[model samples]
Target: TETIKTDVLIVGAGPCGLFAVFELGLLDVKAHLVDILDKVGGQCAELYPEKPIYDIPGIPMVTGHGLTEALMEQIKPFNPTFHLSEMVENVEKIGDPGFRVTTNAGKVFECTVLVVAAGGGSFLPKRPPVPGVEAYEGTSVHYAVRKMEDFRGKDILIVGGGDSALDWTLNLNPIAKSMTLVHRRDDFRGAPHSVEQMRQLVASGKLDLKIGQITELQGDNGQLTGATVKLNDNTTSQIKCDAMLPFFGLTMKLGPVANWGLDLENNLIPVDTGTFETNVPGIFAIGDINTYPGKLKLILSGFHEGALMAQKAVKYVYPDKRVVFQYTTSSTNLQKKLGVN
Candidate 1:
């Protein structure tokens, strides 16, 4: 096993995890981030890249892709090393509160401080229970849209009732040659505004909305030809489509994080609100993966938690050095770290 040493090891490459690199970087601590996804941004880039988010503090509006891109730019000076497409399978306390994390891809990372910013744990989409559906997973059937051009000029059928289904239906409508949305019920669980927009499109005959469940896939050699939809009235119809996108929402499980010997409440890591540290010293949990009294599962809340976590982490990484609080606007050292001056 190849071993690498760093000051801090971040377990998730989501927005909060990316921000942790900046917070630790200001303290002259280097970080190494690892994520299961091939690219960064976690669920933002994986689940919904085109969906709009308006509640991100100063920014009035931004897509998931935009927010992730902005965070990448903000931490460019940190030069955080990323190990993608690797799942952290093991974490053990090697020395006095120091950790050695091992990934499924056979990478070993040793660090003084461990940060768990894995949002909602490891997320996997809930797939339709159709027979032989597994055969077409990476081919003509997909759980999430990684690229928009893949569905261009193709017949698309999206299945789900949540925000992911509704958002992708609207986002992919323009490029898709024909689009159909299928759900078990007509009432949507998405935002009222988004549902209203989808209804408007259906009324205008711009998109097709069906109330049913996908029962079977008709294809040959893992290439999808169409899907059989079972309607509510004991009727079935064949929907012609080359590609089927099923956004049945995410099946979020704690995965290997459950065996980490940390204190957990309802599958969430319990951390102190001040330092966001877990029961284990020098180990912190921030973002949606952590729980505390009055804990908010918002991105901004994660940002605040990361900043506080870094302060405590600095002391552990450099116990002899005194940590003086300084603002980025006034501190030359902070500016120099950010490559601003």
Candidate 2:
């Protein structure tokens, strides 16, 4: 078991949790973020990556994926550690003001403050129904792109009709040695602009777009060599590719978080509005997974809650240090921490 120690351990790599890293960083509290999904962004990336979201304070409009990317870039100065594709299995109070968190992957995290920003619980990716696909999962087949560089210089085949498929197809086309996108039908469920963009690539002979379903995966010892694709015209074609990305979408579940000792109101963690802390001290619940009187489940609200949560949480992690509130525009310490000057 690999054990990690941090000032704050954030149980969710969603937008709220990502922002929490920045807030906690300002107070000199380093953090490590963990998420069940292979990548960060939580529901935003899993549920609706291309969906538009308005009313995010200053930003008039942005896609779910856009906001997540922005938050990730915003917290880059903090250098927060992330443990992805691991479900937090246990969270127990250790010392008087600390907790020990363990994941199904046998990774352990010990921290002074625990923040729950697990937005509407865990998101399990919907796998393609092809036989023996599970065997090649982590090797050659993947559901989400945790790292774009993994597909570099490889023949890649993407399957799906939704935004995720189209988005990845566009993003990885230039990187992959050759790219082919296959769907059950040509009528995509993605944005019109994205669909047009993909069509343009196909028309320009830069991409191989096909209307088909994967009937069989041809590989040896968990390494993909090709796939048998059943075309819409009932003809089978063998497409050679080293990697396959199938994005069907995601399914939501409360998961192991339900077993945590916090008071749960219909799968949502009940937290005090003042500090966003649950019944347990030094433990906070924010974002969609949290509930309070007159609470709104919007991203902006979660951002607000995270800021307030960090204000109260600084005391727990740094009992001897005095927290002086200051604006980023004027505070030299915050400016230095942000590395803007």
Candidate 3:
């Protein structure tokens, strides 16, 4: 119901979108970012947090998580407002070359410029293939735990053997009336010490572990009362629980970024290589989601696109301002903003 006002609204909080903030900040233009994932660092944090990245420039090598952290630090002077764990669902052209963006979580933002730095696409949690799972999504069945207090004193059923599943299982077990851990097999995909800790809880009679896959649900209209599990032994059973959390994995899709009034070439936004602006005047598309002739979908290329996009965007934010062709090393104004002084 509340609307945030900003000079620029960046659609993705990935490395490129984040770097765009630094570029804009140097020009004295402010920015706010919205991302679908609960955390920042889009693809790097979600797909390859621990994986090594070889071509970040100057750094030689950096892990995905490490790069995200560095980008986060570099933009500290910008102080951009981050609206995370929310996806940009709708966008309306409100002002002259301006937009009113709305997120699925009911948050709204009004900004002069919109930047689409969504690389690849948004990372969406994979819904369990079981029938009737959709009906109970925001209710008894959940993909993420937003608040632990909500599950307190309630019997909870957690699915998956990954970090999300195990972390929540351990964190919520102490507060839940009962905790049941269910997986397809005895193996867990993420976290080793947490698995060891979870086993200790099982031995202490604090946790219940069931190796099985969910086949059916026993609830209706956002109320999940029970679930039918098919164990590896080929035996089916119904477990008593009021809520469930399933962490199957994540899949990338273009999502609503396509719905906005923009031209797409091969599922990617077509941008003018000069300004990196899309067909829309004040809207620009950068990063992997945008395509152009000789466009390299590398992180460094996205960084280059952002630097160009900011020059044109600054005009919308500061109409009377003239461009200052200066580097951070020589420009005291820029150096002061970066805390280099």
How many Å off is the CA of 245 in candidate 2?
A: 12
172-203: candidate 3 lDDT, tens digit per residue: 98899988889888876687999898889999
Q: Tens digit of lDDT per residue, candidate 2, span 191-277?
A: 899999999999998788778889898887888999999898899988889998898877878888888877889788999888999
Candidates 2 and 3 compared by TM-score, better number: 3
Q: What order do you get sorting by TM-score, best first?
A: 3, 2, 1
Tens digits of per-residue lDDT for model 1, 15-66: 9999998899999989999887778998788777889998889999999999
How does each model score on TM-score?
0.68, 0.69, 0.91
Residue 8, candidate 1: how far off, in angstroms? 1.0
lDDT of each: 0.88, 0.88, 0.88
- Candidate 1, after superposition: displacement of residue 193 in Å? 30
The numbered model that scores best in TM-score is 3
Pairs in clash, predicted candidate 2:
none
